[PDB]
From a paper:
The best characterized system is [name] (bR), a light-driven proton pump, due to its biochemical robustness. The retinal chromophore of bR ([name]) is linked to the side chain of Lys216 via a protonated Schiff base (PSB). Photon absorption by all-trans retinal triggers a functional photocycle consisting of a series of distinct spectroscopic intermediates (I→J→K→L→M→N→O) with sub-ps (I), ps (J), µs (K, L) and ms (M, N, O) lifetimes. Deprotonation of the Schiff base of photoisomerized 13-cis retinal and protonation of Asp85 during the L→M transition ultimately results in proton translocation to the extracellular side of the membrane.
Data from the nominally 0.5-ps delay were binned into 12 groups according to their actual time delay covering 0.24–0.74 ps. Within the first time point of 0.24 ps, the C9=C10 bond also distorts and undulates on the sub-ps timescale, while the C13=C14 bond torsion mostly progresses. The largest displacements, in opposite directions, are at atoms C14 and C10, while C8 undergoes minor distortion in the same direction as C10. In the present multiphoton regime, i.e. beyond the two-photon regime characterized by the spectroscopic data (≤180 GW cm−2), the situation most likely involves population of several all-trans excited states Sn followed by ultrafast multi-path electronic relaxation (≤0.5 ps, phase I) leading to hot populations in S0 and S1, with distorted retinal conformations and longer vibrational relaxation times on the electronic excited potential energy surface, compared to the single-photon regime. The C12-C13=C14-C15 torsion angle changes from −150° to −135° during 0.24–0.74 ps and refined to −112° at 1 ps and −100° at 3 ps.
Numbering used by the authors:
A (entry chain A), B (entry chain A), C (entry chain A): 4 to 234
Write the structure that this text describes.
């Protein structure tokens, strides 16, 4: 395990996701409100899935070698397995907060699936120049998602409770900033142009992942917006 | 890319799915009705997914070699990845049109999953005679789906709005004819008996795919059946 | 096929799932009640999926070799493909019976996904001692599911119809006993410590699978709890 310099960040990531999972699990024990239960379920599952995939990367299972540029390049494929399930759960948290219509939710989840799926294909593609074609398609799917979060959701939040409108606005802003960093790190890291070494890349993704999951969850689950308006 | 004679049909397929995706995306921009949004979301996602998988076939990612009959046989596995997601979306379009009950929808999607999954296993099976066992099981799942579309849905459409009944009937008929061709092409093509060469097989699937997705979508999204009855 | 001593149990399993599938399919033909249709759909799909995966194991497709302990160890990976889809369907049968809230259903299905997914990783892991780390995480996800079935569902059933409360209690008890055997068989069988040989392991899983699917389904589909209260 320690044979890879990036192991320290995989281990820290595993620990922080594990701790985040346990914290949300305990916190949600005292919850009976049916609406709050939905948000706790979604939000606890996110770091639990990430915990398993960080562990698989730490132990070496979630790593494969991909030939491109005349080299055997270490590619952590387990990231995409994580993201396939956790990024639509994160979007679902946002969509339920603002009572999004079903068509909009399906558009978001579908675009998200395309985003992660094409990122996976790009990560595993052996023809170097083609990796960036997949990156571009994935990034276009991301831009669609960000567009919807701003010009379909923000003006939906404003007709809702003030506490859900303010909580949505904060989580929207956190999401757009954090999620936009992922394609940049991929592009300059070992999957793309290879300018930033894998150990630093792994650190960067770990900070983004913990912030986008445990950070996000801490903000959401401390808000009164997750509860039905009750006396 | 041009090293494979079937590349021209993969390229045309990619282009037509891409163009179809953009057309539906633009067309649905001016839509606020919650019901119509569902149909636009579902129907736009279908060629978008197909676009990505056609591209993966064009670039060579979605192709593998399978030993059977003492030969290395080129198998485009990306078709099944496409179909796994797009065929239940197509069925969902039909089921929502007639306000199908939840049990019926689950039966359809489940049978569809079995249909595509067993087709994939058959496509990748190395014992030649066993490929046709999987083809038979998949075809039985197809026949179940077609049965339900006729003797569970058609008489559901007739108690609904005339515009939804007439639109459903047309899309049902398009679906049954087009979908029934797929097992025949598989059986006589490079996956099955090998009587029709891969380049012609690829052409045939491209015509079926564009018709079943973009053709289907053009009929559906031009109907007033996708809108709630409103003043 | 007969080259593997466990083939007889794979063949019997295939037959019993096939027969169970046909029986439930015929039985549900005379059903119009929308609630009952849901239970028939879910419950018929379960042995149908299991039939396909038992067949893939019989024909040899669903088997791979995994190096650990200095040996090539036969691992039937198709079990996890089965279980990935059938165990959440089984939980859905239980959850719908007691009209579980959406948050609880998502927690169950999510924990179940983690349970099966980590079992799959453990089954395919090449470092022997690490296989048991994945077994432990999977078992913890199982224990969560069993906890919810007892201390979240049982007291939900009691405020419902007596026929649904009594049917739920029986199916809950069947589920907890049968499902708890699976991690034990894995641990002592060819995936784990290797004390029980593969042919006996295969027998054990076949008895558990038929009981947990066809047995379970026979109890559920003969109950009046699956019908809406109607005059
Ligand atoms: C009911 O609605 C609220 C339940 O949501 C909360 C439900 C949770 C989503 C349940 C899912 C967590 C499972 C219990 C997962 C089990 C293994 C976990 C990964 C635990 C890992 C952390 C520990 C090992 C440090
Ligand atoms: C509604 C939304 C969910 C829409 C989803 C959007 C989605 C369509 C976007 C594209 C997804 C698609 C790229 C998934 C591809 C998975 C694939 C990378 C798995 C690895 O297999 C690739 C090659 C080795 O590189 O296998 C070597 C050759 C092997 C023989 C491969 C044969 C097995 C195939 C992988 C079977 C395909 C199954 C499905 C792709 C399962 C989807 C997995 C998940 C990653 C989407
Ligand atoms: C809101 O409900 C309506 C939105 O549906 C319409 C929503 C669409 C389903 C959004 C999904 C499309 C994504 C934007 C996919 C991005 C890449 C596409 C494959 C674009 C490819 C076509 C172009 C490259 C020729
Ligand atoms: C409700 C509905 C959805 C019901 C669904 C119906 C469904 C049950 C029908 C059968 C689906 C099942 C056949 C999927 C099999 C996928 C498999 C072909 C992927 C390729 O792996 C096959 C061999 C190489 O040929 O791998 C070589 C050996 C490797 C070590 C394989 C180990 C990895 C396994 C593939 C893990 C299994 C994961 C699940 C099958 C994911 C499902 C993928 C999708 C195609 C259904
Ligand atoms: C409508 O709601 C009730 C339908 O549920 C019942 C619907 C069923 C879930 C339909 C799914 C079964 C498909 C017809 C599967 C076809 C192949 C089967 C595996 C048949 C195998 C058994 C036989 C070959 C012995
Ligand atoms: C809401 C709930 C559903 C939550 C779900 C919980 C879930 C997160 C729990 C963990 C699931 C995760 C372990 C699935 C891993 C599948 C993996 C074993 C498939 C086989 O690939 C493993 C190695 C060979 O051993 O591939 C060799 C290297 C290859 C290059 C691998 C590259 C292809 C990757 C497999 C692509 C990943 C796609 C997704 C994992 C699809 C999920 C399949 C299913 C088994 C969950
Ligand atoms: C918890 C993990 C999260 C929130 C991950 C988010 C990841 C993305 C938004 C990834 C986006 C990518 C692209 C837009 C193109 C390049 C490849 C990706 C997959 C890194
Ligand atoms: C957009 C793509 C569509 C509508 C594809 C439909 C495909 C089928 C109905 C495929 C059916 C098959 C069988 C019935 C058995 C042989 C294998 C298949 C998968 C080709
Ligand atoms: C129809 C099949 C059923 C009901 C299978 C149930 C399987 C399980 C509950 C498996 C549990 C496992 C663990 C808890 C850890 C070890 C690995 C598994 C996957 C066997
Ligand atoms: C969105 C953030 C992307 C920028 C990442 C900056 C990383 C700077 C680290 C120094 C680069 C290491 C190069 C020498 C090894
Ligand atoms: C459902 C349509 C299946 C029939 C396809 C007919 C294809 C005819 C093309 C000629 C066959 C090529 C054989 C000589 C290369
Ligand atoms: C939950 C049941 C697990 C116990 C399984 C008992 C199997 C006993 C069979 C005898 C073991 C075979 C060892 C000699 C080959
Ligand atoms: C490819 C995996 C996509 C599914 C991820 C799980 C999250 C799905 C959330 C469903 C949202 C509800 C839509 C109506
Ligand atoms: C194996 C992939 C199956 C899922 C495909 C996505 C479409 C699912 C549509 C869900 C229909 C709603 C059922 C209640
Ligand atoms: C990884 C596969 C998980 C999906 C299995 C299919 C069963 C899903 C049942 C959905 C229950 C409804 C939740 C709201
Ligand atoms: C186009 C929608 C406006 C809100 C999205 C902001 C786009 C940020 C760009 C992210 C950088 C990705 C490379
Ligand atoms: C049995 C249901 C009647 C409607 C379905 C028509 C079946 C068409 C056969 C398709 C050919 C597949 C090989
Ligand atoms: C902790 C919840 C109480 C009900 C679950 C009973 C646990 C049975 C243990 C199963 C054995 C697995 C190794
Ligand atoms: C070796 C790099 C070749 C450049 C490929 C860039 C493709 C980016 C596509 C953006 C439309
Ligand atoms: C080499 C071909 C052997 C014939 C197999 C046909 C099987 C079809 C099954 C239909 C019930
Ligand atoms: C070779 C076996 C080494 C023992 C591993 C047991 C790990 C079990 C983890 C339970 C917390
Ligand atoms: C990680 C295993 C958890 C089993 C005990 C249940 C914890 C309490 C959860 C309350 C919903
Ligand atoms: C509760 C702490 C969980 C941390 C387990 C994984 C950390 C890796 C240590 C090497
Ligand atoms: C908008 C046109 C999209 C076409 C891109 C793929 C066509 C392949 C050209 C070689
Ligand atoms: C209807 C009987 C189904 C049995 C088919 C599979 C049994 C395997 C026989 C070798
Ligand atoms: C993006 C950083 C999130 C910070 C989380 C802090 C949570 C405290 C309530
Ligand atoms: C099956 C062929 C479909 C033809 C689509 C034409 C759409 C015009 C409205
Ligand atoms: C766990 C054993 C189940 C027994 C099923 C018998 C069904 C008869 C109604
Ligand atoms: C990591 C366990 C958290 C302890 C409880 C925190 C207050 C709910
Ligand atoms: C008003 C919300 C500001 C949140 C910005 C957080 C940036 C990481
Ligand atoms: C809305 C601001 C987006 C900031 C992008 C930051 C990418 C590192
Ligand atoms: C391909 C872009 C379509 C242009 C608009 C067509 C009329 C909505
Ligand atoms: C009355 C509907 C006829 C549609 C037939 C289309 C055949 C491709
Ligand atoms: C309902 C008519 C079906 C026609 C099947 C055509 C197969 C090529
Ligand atoms: C296996 C076929 C079952 C025959 C009908 C049983 C009574 C519904
Ligand atoms: C009162 C229900 C008892 C069911 C026990 C079944 C054990 C297999
Ligand atoms: C509730 C009793 C569980 C029995 C476990 C049996 C495991 C073989």
């Amino acid at each position: 395990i320690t044979g890879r310099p990036e192991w320290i960040w995989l281990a820290l990531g595993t620990a922080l996701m594990g701790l985040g999972t346990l914290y949300f699990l305990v916190k949600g024990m005292g919850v009976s409100d049916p609406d709050a239960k939905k948000f706790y379920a979604i939000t606890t599952l996110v770091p639990a899935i990430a915990f398993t995939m960080y562990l698989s990367m730490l132990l070496g299972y979630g790593l494969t070698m991909v030939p491109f540029g005349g080299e055997q390049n270490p590619i952590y494929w387990a990231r995409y397995a994580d993201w396939l399930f956790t990024t639509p759960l994160l979007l679902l948290d946002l969509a339920l907060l603002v009572d999004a219509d079903q068509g909009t939710i399906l558009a978001l989840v579908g675009a998200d699936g395309i985003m992660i799926g094409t990122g996976l294909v790009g990560a595993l593609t052996k023809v170097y120049s083609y990796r960036f074609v997949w990156w571009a398609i994935s990034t276009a799917a991301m831009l669609y998602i960000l567009y919807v979060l701003f010009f379909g959701f923000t003006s939906k939040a404003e007709s809702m409770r003030p506490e859900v409108a303010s909580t949505f606005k904060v989580l929207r802003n956190v999401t757009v900033v954090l999620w936009s960093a992922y394609p940049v790190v991929w592009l300059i890291g070992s999957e793309g142009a290879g300018i930033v070494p894998l150990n630093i890349e792994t650190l960067l993704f770990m900070v983004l992942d913990v912030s986008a999951k445990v950070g996000f969850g801490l903000i959401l689950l401390r808000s009164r917006a997750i509860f039905g308006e009750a006396e």
